[PDB]
Amino acid sequence: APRKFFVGGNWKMNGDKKSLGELIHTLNGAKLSADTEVVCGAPSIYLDFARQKLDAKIGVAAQNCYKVPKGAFTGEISPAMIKDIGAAWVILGHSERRHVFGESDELIGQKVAHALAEGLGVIACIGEKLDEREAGITEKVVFEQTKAIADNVKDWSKVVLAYEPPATPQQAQEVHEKLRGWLKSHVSDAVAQSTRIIYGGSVTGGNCKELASQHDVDGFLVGGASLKPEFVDIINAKH
Amino acid sequence: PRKFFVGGNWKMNGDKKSLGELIHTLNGAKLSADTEVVCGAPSIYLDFARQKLDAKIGVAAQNCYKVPKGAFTGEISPAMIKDIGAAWVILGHSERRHVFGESDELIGQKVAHALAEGLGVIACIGEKLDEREAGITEKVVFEQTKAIADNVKDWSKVVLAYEPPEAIGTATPQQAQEVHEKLRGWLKSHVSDAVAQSTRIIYGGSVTGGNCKELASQHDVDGFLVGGASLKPEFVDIINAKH
């Protein structure tokens, strides 16, 4: 009945076999809470390596994918390829994809639909721009982004929503509560109660316990700290 | 002499089983010793491809970013490509320019970074169909080449790939030769005589087992960047287009 705590580590564009090997060694040897679902998001070039080296209890995510299984899309990878390597998740709609690479809500929706149809789990990311937060339209913006994802989700069992603010723990709770309210009204009470909504702002060993104590925060999508030993402490934030 | 160069761009195709089969075929084929062969694999399979391909065959990434590390979810860097043992990256492919909106400026920044990091670059240029129809092919490809050239210090590790636009139902070896000769003339005056003489300019249009010999006989065509046929048995014949 309770939502299982979920901690994803987004390595972003970082690592080589040496540094990631050391990272993976530390995670494999660490005492990790049985009550946390852990997923590591590796650069595409290291997905195979990461899946081979990581203990099976730790999931592997791709950091992006495209919206069809194959084709004339030089530089892209598909859910079929991600599954072929043994990864079970993909991060979609990350703030950096939206803002540096201009990925639209429409495209992200198409990717979500395809990844889910192909049997992957999706960490679906949403978050408003700084100017939008300053203008007081956080809710309007994140609801639009969430609707664009939701319209492409037939089954929420393998979806985790990640909120990335452009930020206080109280401010985090406020957005998470509003997002869960959106799910309740626009999808169902069952989906609202069961869907993990994870926090994708700045998460460190210093602030993770306070964030994890918030009623509507179900875990984290961790950035820089996911490359460091303190990722273990973040996984164990509730203990 | 300009060594004949054949790159096989697999694009977004394959899995370990199917790419393993295609690699096994290449490893066992009678490939001309006078062709420099490079296979362009999806990023997720670059490590695999380098492990399985004979050392004589190069491996290319299909794209990369412009710094070694950072907050660029979904991107890979030249440092990572080198880490995997690959020695090439394809940059500025028509699909990156068109589908993904990569600018001349960004492509130039990527070229400069990949070269600084010690990779070879297959630098792609080519006009859109509407531009070819307007008769401004030359203007467009020179603009794109300038953006690349401004970011190349040593041309020894660059191969230039010309991609004519796909007809989509609405080209000739002579037409390929015409563009390649113009590009070489551009290099002569904008870079140097030596760079024009030594730089491979490869053809990235529709290359098949059936048209490859005629294309390879053109005076200013130095090889191919092969799309669909790189997934077919005839890729071996294309590698052997001079013979």
Supply the CATH number for residue A114's domain: 3.20.20.70
Q: Which chain A positions have a beta carbon within 8 Å of B119's beta carbon?
A: none
Among A10, A45, A76, beta carbon nearest to B12: A76
Q: Domain residues for B201? A: 1-243
Q: Which chain B positions have a beta carbon within 8 Å of A13's beta carbon?
A: 65, 67, 69-73, 75-77
Deposited resolution, Å: 1.3
Spatial CB neighbours of A124, under 8 Å, sequence gap ≥ 6: A92, A93, A108, A112, A149, A159, A160, A161, A162
CA B194 to chain A, closest CA, distance in angstroms equals 32
Provide the annotated binding site of B.
9, 11
Domain count, chain A: 1
Of the candidates A47, A10, A38, A5, the residue with the CA atom closest to the CA atom of residue A228: A10
Find out whether B157 and B191 touch, Cβ atoms under 8 Å: no
Find out whether A182 and A197 touch, Cβ atoms under 8 Å: no
Q: Which chain A positions have a beta carbon within 8 Å of B71's beta carbon?
A: 12-13, 96, 223
Tokens read off for A48? 């195979």
Provide the number of CB pairs (under 8 Å) joining chain A to chain B. Answer: 122
Which residues on chain A place their C-beta less than 8 Å from a C-beta of chain B?
Answer: 10, 12-17, 41, 43-49, 62-64, 66, 68, 70-78, 80-82, 84-85, 91, 94-97, 100-102, 223
User: Where in the sequence numbering do the catalytic residues of B fall?
Assistant: 93, 163
C-alpha torsion sign, points B10, B14, B15, B16: negative
Spatial CB neighbours of A15, under 8 Å, sequence gap ≥ 6: A23, A42, A43, A46, A227, B80
DSSP secondary structure of chain A: -PPPEEEEEE--B---HHHHHHHHHHHHHS---TTEEEEEEE-GGGHHHHHHHS-TTSEEEES---SSSSBS-TT---HHHHHHTT--EEEES-HHHHHTS---HHHHHHHHHHHHHTT-EEEEEE---HHHHHTT-HHHHHHHHHHHHHTT-S-GGGEEEEE-----HHHHHHHHHHHHHHHHHHT-HHHHHH--EEE-S---TTTHHHHHTSTT--EEEESGGGGSTTHHHHHTTT-
Spatial CB neighbours of A135, under 8 Å, sequence gap ≥ 6: none
Residue of B nearest to A75 (CA): B62
